[PDB]
Amino acid sequence: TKPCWYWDKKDLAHTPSQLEGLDPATEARYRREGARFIFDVGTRLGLHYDTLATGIIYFHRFYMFHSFKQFPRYVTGACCLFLAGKVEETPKKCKDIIKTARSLLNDVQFGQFGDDPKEEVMVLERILLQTIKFDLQVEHPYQFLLKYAKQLKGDKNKIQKLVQMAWTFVNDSLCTTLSLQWEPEIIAVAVMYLAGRLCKFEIQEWTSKPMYRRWWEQFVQDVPVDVLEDICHQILDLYSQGKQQMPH
Amino acid sequence: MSYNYVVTAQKPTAVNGCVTGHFTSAEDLNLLIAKNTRLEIYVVTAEGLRPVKEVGMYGKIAVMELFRPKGESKDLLFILTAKYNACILEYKQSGESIDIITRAHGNVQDRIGRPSETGIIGIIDPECRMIGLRLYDGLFKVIPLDRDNKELKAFNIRLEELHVIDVKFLYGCQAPTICFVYQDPQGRHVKTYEVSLREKEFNKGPWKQENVEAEASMVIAVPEPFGGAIIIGQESITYHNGDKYLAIAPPIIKQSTIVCHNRVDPNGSRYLLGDMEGRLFMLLLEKEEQMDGTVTLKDLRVELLGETSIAECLTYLDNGVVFVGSRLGDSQLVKLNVDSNEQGSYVVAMETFTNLGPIVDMCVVDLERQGQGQLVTCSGAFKEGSLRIIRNGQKLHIRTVPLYESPRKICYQEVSQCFGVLSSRIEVQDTSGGTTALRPSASTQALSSSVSSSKLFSSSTAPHETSFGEEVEVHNLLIIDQHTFEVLHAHQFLQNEYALSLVSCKLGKDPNTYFIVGTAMVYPEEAEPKQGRIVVFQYSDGKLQTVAEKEVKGAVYSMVEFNGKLLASINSTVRLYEWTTEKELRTECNHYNNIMALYLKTKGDFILVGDLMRSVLLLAYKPMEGNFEEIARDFNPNWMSAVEILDDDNFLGAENAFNLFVCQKDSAATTDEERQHLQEVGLFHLGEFVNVFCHGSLVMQNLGETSTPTQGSVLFGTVNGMIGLVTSLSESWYNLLLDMQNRLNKVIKSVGKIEHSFWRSFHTERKTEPATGFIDGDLIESFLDISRPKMQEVVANLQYDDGSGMKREATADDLIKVVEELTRIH
Amino acid sequence: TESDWGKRCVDKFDIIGIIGEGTYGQVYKAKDKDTGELVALKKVRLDNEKEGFPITAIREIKILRQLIHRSVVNMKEIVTDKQDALDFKKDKGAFYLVFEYMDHDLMGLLESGLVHFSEDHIKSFMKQLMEGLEYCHKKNFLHRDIKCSNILLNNSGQIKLADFGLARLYNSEESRPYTNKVITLWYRPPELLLGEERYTPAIDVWSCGCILGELFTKKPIFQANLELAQLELISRLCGSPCPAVWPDVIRLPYFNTMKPKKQYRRRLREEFSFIPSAALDLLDHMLTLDPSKRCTAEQTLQSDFLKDVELSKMAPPDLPHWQDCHELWS
């Protein structure tokens, strides 16, 4: 019926890119750069946050089946955003994506698009569709962050601080392979869990079950703390590796 | 775009309705006969009928009734067309000048309504106060006959009874009253309402509802001396009037359904009844006068008079003369005698009026080697079945070959100097377990005879129980000599086997010329036939030999010879068979993208497929590959009645709505999609139901015949006997004749003031489109009959184009010459 | 696996013929070589390369892999032309969307004049259509192109909704600007004629009400070629748009611009007097001018006309058969 789009962390040691001699750090960098390229190009074009995320998910899934050495990332990214716009009903003309991609990329980077940028992108749409197995519908942590937050009642100002901080962590998790490890429902819980720890909030008090200390179990069944901690560790690693710090 | 021309070679001959009255003068006795789109007016004499006037109307005549409102000297005529054009007509004569006056007119179509099963019904009040129309289920439309209603404005009265069988205005009522039979889940019932023009609604009727026979078919409004109504059924005739109720159920009428009625005595004492087997009855109202001075109905009696043609309409004229209007056979004048003849009959035929009847099939053949061509038609049904040989010589000469059974398909085999004709006759389950024919006919009157002994379906194990009295069809192949038209041989097909298609041809390397028949095993239980045969016969030395048989899994609706191969359509499949050196049929290739492949035509390696609901498809045989290729389909859905190939690019089709259309390859090779779309470039409302298209012409060819502007010749036969002709034009000639039509329509006065453009508009229940790509040649040929002032008025400011001179003005003498050449194609 | 779409080749189908011309390609009837099942293949041509894979097809792939309903057409898989070996740039081969083949489409049956609907047949037809629509509306999807041609019918009596090329998600909380001109004029709701642009799922209901009437009349109810002419015809039967019946009509862009000849009164019950009472009430509610007062799909399923209809009995219509080829002599 429907395909499986989730892998184990250990499996990422065997992507096509890794097996062609790319080391784990380089593929991680190529993924951040491609995701952020998708994010920045679409933000300049005024695109909805779901449209950006969908393109990024296509992008991440694509390079579970192909190598970064044979498919230039920025072309792939532009193609994913181009298709994402049509899937999410926020369409853009390919020429406009190229225009924006040229504005943001230097001369070396834009060399990936070759002599005819639009053609390189439009041609890839075929491989993209076959690669993502024509499974175009994607759900993202954002909707669950909001669906679950609405069921919290208490200090409006503390809950909105929780949401925005969690929302930021969702945007930051798009640069990582968490999209390929855990369903979005779990991601949304993990970012609520993380923000709560950082803001020193006890979310259970805001739930309909204020003495149920594992507050997330009413939103997402069968999620151990092991998973939420693994996700939190991966998100904060991005902040520690860079110079940026937790939003707070 | 495509340009075509359509003319009538023979006008409709079937009688659709007939009335009597005092229409031309308050003094004369008139007979008005309605053929499709044609009104014939006669005056009754002691010898027969004197014709006086005939008019055409731009519409199918659905209702025709004569009435005389208070203040009029003579009867007026009401006509309603099948497109809901209503009008009131008056006859006016000034010496030698006869014209028809349109007194009132309008279109009574409703925006929202469901057309009724039993069709349009129109009746008029005995006091001529209103016209009642039953057009849609659940609605009764009233046109009040006030002198100011010159537009025939009307209103609808809600009618609770949705399924009405028949309705009539009653005599002898205090208010306008309707009596009608209707059907609901509890059976059929008879009911009355009163019609109030003041309130514009129904009021409670004079007498209560009564339950009536399940197959109660017709309502008779009995005149003032008796009053009330008579209800005709399959088994019984009943009289209803308040508290009075009679019922006679003579076994005589159960045998055949009664379809028509007429009043003999104005007081209602005697009526005529006719049935589908051609029997003519007298229905007698036996009077009993009480000492009160009142007159009541004592009893009913039915008496068999004799046999007539299967009549759509009867009308008693005067003395002993009755006019029999026949749609399935020739119409007649017959005389009813008081004394029976030595055979027991009171009916003796006086005159016989030719009716080409339903033209089921036809072919054109050069019998005498004249290069002219004669048309042999399968005409009529049941006892009226016939073969009609038609030649041009200024009238058409028609020869009739009586068959007394239904002719289905015809094909000519020159090698054998004979025709092959498929026919079916009605037998009835009898006490022997077998069946018995109601009369002898062509298949039982053959010189030599044979019966299929095929064992293909003999395994059966499928039960089909028979009840005494039920009808069955028995199908035969008739071999008929081309000079004597004597039935030389009759081959009877298997029990429950229908013969659907017939060809005469040579196949492969076989030098023998065969008759090939495609059949279907028809059982009442099945929705679509699932068994059938293709049978190869050889007619040699007076006997028919079965040469080979091929079993198929469906009905062989159509067959056509394809370059030494046999092309046959079996249900959805279109198949091409090869004829082997072992004299057996071998399948080469198939095409399956059809719903029901009813019709087939070929030109070269191209095939035109006509479908039940998917219009027409253009196939091609690919000899390099040994298979079919879909070239182009007409995706506009139509219910087809016949198809024909005009040329390599244009294709002609006929709809079950009485419409013609032409499809063409879009001839634009930009995209594959454009080529695969057949575009309907011609649309035309014919007004007739076309069964058979056939290439050929009836005109004499000495070859000294001037080359007409028209190119090509397709004849077609219709259900009402009308024979027409379709031919092609150049763009230059189309524009000239089209521009002339628009001018003629402004000049010529239409009966009922019906717009010609409206009449020819493509019309289904769902859509209406303006005609395109078709010249109404019958309109063009009327230019020669309009007066000189009108002719010159037409040619004013008329220019020719694309000719020897790019712009050239037309004169009335110039166009007279052009039309006269156009009359020479038929 | 069954889920790895886009790889299997169209070689696996014997093409029977072209059943229709679509929007993004031609639709072909075909037989599966392995199972024998009959399918309908919607061809997707990306060769234009103007904007790549057509969005109309993307909508149908995105939505119909989510929707599971007996009355909603199922996309079985997506297959491709023989792809050029490892040269994707030159590769211009097409994709095909595989669907279950349905025997007929309502337009074809009605246009040919070869279908008769009893009340019980209309009940089974409408109940399936409303259930399919309710499923879609419950999932917050709009069809936006309800037409008789988009209602496929098998001879068993099963109905399925088909062309989801214009279908989009509906958000109640947030109004989104959509495309004003979506439904074909004959089935277009009055609100879109005046240009709401922010329309409700009630647009689909109006279309299905137009079908309900057409099944009883056998002729489409509102046939016009121009948008103003359509408003006039609708206005004559359903009443002229006026503030009393449609309080918010004044905000619609073209209300002052597009006005009927008169302020017609509602005549629907009078003109459809022949329709059974249980059905007439459904039509009155389905053909309500104000989208906020127009009934929902669920409300139609909880109507006297449809609530007690049992889908175990599908009641097939009186469909084309063999004697329909022969004309009756008497």
Numbering used by the authors:
A (entry chain C): 20 to 267
B (entry chain A): 1 to 393, 708 to 1140
C (entry chain B): 715 to 1044
Which passages does the manuscript contain on this structure?
Recently, several unexpectedly diverse compounds were reported to deplete cyclin K by linking CDK12–cyclin K to the DDB1–CUL4–RBX1 E3 ligase. Here, to investigate how chemically dissimilar small molecules trigger cyclin K degradation, we evaluated 91 candidate degraders in structural, biophysical and cellular studies and reveal all compounds acquire glue activity via simultaneous CDK12 binding and engagement of DDB1 interfacial residues, in particular Arg928. Crystallographic dissection of 28 ternary complexes demonstrated that despite considerable diversity of the molecular glues, the overall complex architecture is highly similar. The low-affinity DDB1–CDK12 interaction primes the complex, while the ligand, through filling the kinase pocket and bridging over to DDB1, drives robust association, offering a rationale for the unusually broad chemical diversity observed.
We also synthesized six compounds that are hybrids of SR-4835 and CR8 (DS18 (65), DS17 (66), DS19, DS22 (67), DS21 (68) and DS20 (69)), yielding a series bearing all possible combination of the R1-3 substituents. SR-4835, DS17 and DS18 were CDK12 selective, while CR8 and DS19 were not, linking potent pleiotropic CDK inhibition to the co-existence of phenylpyridine and isopropyl substituents on the purine scaffold. Hence, the modification of the gluing moiety from phenylpyridine to dichlorobenzimidazole (CR8 versus DS17, DS19 versus DS18) is sufficient to increase the gluing potency and reduce off-target CDK inhibitory effects of CR8. The ten best-performing degraders were DS73, DS71, DS72, DS17, DS18, SR-4835, WX3, CR8, 21195 and DS28, a list that overlaps remarkably well (8/10) with our in vitro data. Performing the assay at lower protein concentrations for selected compounds revealed subnanomolar dissociation constants for the top derivatives (for example, DS17) but presented experimental challenges with a limited assay window. Notably, the compound’s Tanimoto similarity to CR8 and its in vitro activity show no clear correlation, with the ten best DDB1–CDK12 molecular glues (DS18, 21195, DS72, DS17, DS19, DS25, DS73, SR-4835, CR8 and DS16) ranging from CR8-like (1.0) to distinct (0.33), further supporting that diverse chemistries facilitate the formation of this complex. To better dissect the cellular responses, we examined the extent and depth of cellular CDK12, CDK13 and cyclin K degradation by mass spectrometry using quantitative label-free proteomics on MDA-MB-231 cells treated with representative compounds. These experiments identified three of the six compounds tested (DS17, 21195 and SR-4835) to be more effective at depleting cyclin K than CR8 at 1 µM concentration.
